[PDB]
Structure 1
Amino acid sequence: KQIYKTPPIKYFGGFNFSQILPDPSKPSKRSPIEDLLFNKVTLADAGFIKQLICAQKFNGLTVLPPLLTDEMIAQYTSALLAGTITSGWTFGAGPALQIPFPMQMAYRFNGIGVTQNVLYENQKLIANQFNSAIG
């Protein structure tokens, strides 16, 4: 229903999220993974004002532009990601509630039949493995 801003400082108890959070430095305000995905795919036409195969379609074959420009879609993606990183899963069923990230990770562990003491004793190792996989 709403849009959630990213937290001012990116510290989450050893976890690293630079590769997926929005990057203010770039003009497009897109995460590096999003930028790589954008660059990899080669698109032909996007409905922009036209004036060589695309030029040969002056026979009533036109391409309308999508309603949502692919700049505000990034805003939705950022909103969902910020909500799921700063509020667990409670923002999908009511008013969002804050909660520290390690507690959320411990409860997700407890979901699959592993007691949270495992996380609270191997936090640093888990964070390093997550960072390496994301890298």
Structure 2
Amino acid sequence: SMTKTSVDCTMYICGDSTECSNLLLQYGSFCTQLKRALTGIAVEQDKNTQEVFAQVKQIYKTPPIKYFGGFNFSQILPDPSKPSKRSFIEDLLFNKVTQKFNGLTVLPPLLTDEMIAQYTSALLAGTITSGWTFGAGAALQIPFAMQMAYRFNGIGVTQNVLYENQKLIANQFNSAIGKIQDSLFSTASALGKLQDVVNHNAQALNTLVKQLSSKFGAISSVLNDILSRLDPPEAEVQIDRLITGRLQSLQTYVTQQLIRAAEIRASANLAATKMSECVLGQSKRVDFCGKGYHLMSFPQSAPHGVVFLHVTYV
């Protein structure tokens, strides 16, 4: 999801100028379309954020003692000793990922970060305490060793390979999840998409609100100066010129926002598919849920996105 923004036509274009506001009335519904487009974008952002994470009927919870057959999940299970129940990796992602005064308000997301963290924790608890059974109706508990035997049998490896190599596999998984916190922020590569989304939104807002200093051919970029220094009939031309310039700026901003909203909705549909398949089950699709034979995945909430920890067998 991207940042939800709302725009006021009159305040941005002809703020606190009755005559300028009246002159805008000659363009008809030239900006009710803008308002409707931005409202649709915001509602779609809420729909994306709900569709990606809200895939569990109930909020599952891990048992008080965290022992899952030797697999160390302490780096993705919730940490109670925090104001928001976010795991270690979730907290690191939140920390790493870091204009209103002219009719540009930013709406807050419908789901708080605490609620997204709760959804992620519920999905993780279900996927480690109930296998894939929680994505197909009622959640049926199963020991984690038998669930890893499930997943090994699902990729053409007999379960005795896991049962005779439970210790080595557990150590390998613990080490592999140990290296995530170093292969996430220091090697660049990934994690640039959420930062790019944030930067694109902030930059678009700044560019749209920087157009107020342009002249577009008028005498001055300040409405009050033109109003005071000129008689009404002659100042009408310059006010119309500024109105045209600011309307073009607003329409350009709205168009780029719509295009970016379509791209982000495509990404969010892909993320929802990835959650439903990689997380809520075992995927036989190649390269869809990691490089190798997919075993089972984990979601981690991130600012304006989701992070998957794809466990694979190689």
Q: Normalising to structure 1: TM-score of the pair?
A: 0.87
Contact 2:59/2:122 (<8 A) preserved: yes
Q: Alignment partner of 1:4: what SS?
A: coil
Give the structure 2 partner of residue 95 of structure 1: 138
How many angstroms apart in 2 are the aligned matches of 1:35 and 1:133? 19
The structural deviation recorded for 1:58 is: 1.6
Q: Alignment partner of 2:105: what SS?
A: coil
The structural deviation recorded for 1:92 is: 0.8
* Per-residue CA distance 1:89-118 (angstroms, 9 max, x = gap): 011111111111100101100111111111
The structural deviation recorded for 1:78 is: 0.5
Q: Alignment partner of 1:96: what SS?
A: coil
The structural deviation recorded for 1:16 is: 0.4
1:61 aligns with 2:61: no
The structural deviation recorded for 1:123 is: 0.4
Q: Normalising to structure 2: TM-score of the pair?
A: 0.38
The sequence identity of aligned pairs, in percent, is 98
Q: Alignment partner of 1:3: what SS?
A: coil
Q: Alignment partner of 1:62: what SS?
A: strand
Q: Alignment partner of 2:174: what SS?
A: helix
The structural deviation recorded for 1:17 is: 0.5
Give the structure 2 partner of residue 5 of structure 1: 61
Give the structure 2 partner of residue 27 of structure 1: 83
The structural deviation recorded for 1:69 is: 1.0
Match of 2:167 among 118, 124, 127: 124
* Per-residue CA distance 1:38-94 (angstroms, 9 max, x = gap): 01011xxxxxxxxxxxxx532211111111111111010001100010000011111
Contact 2:75/2:88 (<8 A) preserved: yes
Unaligned 5+ segments in structure 2 are 1-56, 179-314
Q: Give 1 or 2 for the bigger CA radius of gyration.
A: 2
- The count of residues paired between Structure 1 and Structure 2 equals 122
1:114 aligns with 2:157: yes
How many angstroms apart in 2 are the aligned matches of 1:25 and 1:128? 27
How many angstroms apart in 1 are the aligned matches of 2:70 and 2:135? 26
Contact 2:133/2:140 (<8 A) preserved: yes
How many angstroms apart in 2 are the aligned matches of 1:98 and 1:69? 29
Q: Alignment partner of 1:2: what SS?
A: coil
How many angstroms apart in 2 are the aligned matches of 1:69 and 1:77? 13
* Per-residue CA distance 1:9-33 (angstroms, 9 max, x = gap): 1011111010000001122221010
How many angstroms apart in 2 are the aligned matches of 1:3 and 1:57? 37
Unaligned 5+ segments in structure 1 are 43-55
Contact 2:152/2:159 (<8 A) preserved: yes
How many angstroms apart in 1 are the aligned matches of 2:155 and 2:87? 31
RMSD across aligned positions (CA): 0.9
4+ long deviations beyond 6 Å = none
How many angstroms apart in 2 are the aligned matches of 1:19 and 1:41? 19
Q: Alignment partner of 2:104: what SS?
A: coil
Q: Which has more helix, going by share of residues?
A: 2
The structural deviation recorded for 1:122 is: 0.5
Q: Alignment partner of 1:63: what SS?
A: strand
Contact 2:85/2:118 (<8 A) preserved: no
The structural deviation recorded for 1:5 is: 1.6
Q: Which has more strand, going by share of residues?
A: 2
How many angstroms apart in 2 are the aligned matches of 1:84 and 1:37? 21
- Compare relative contact order (CA 8 Å, sep 6+) and give the higher one, 1 or 2: 1
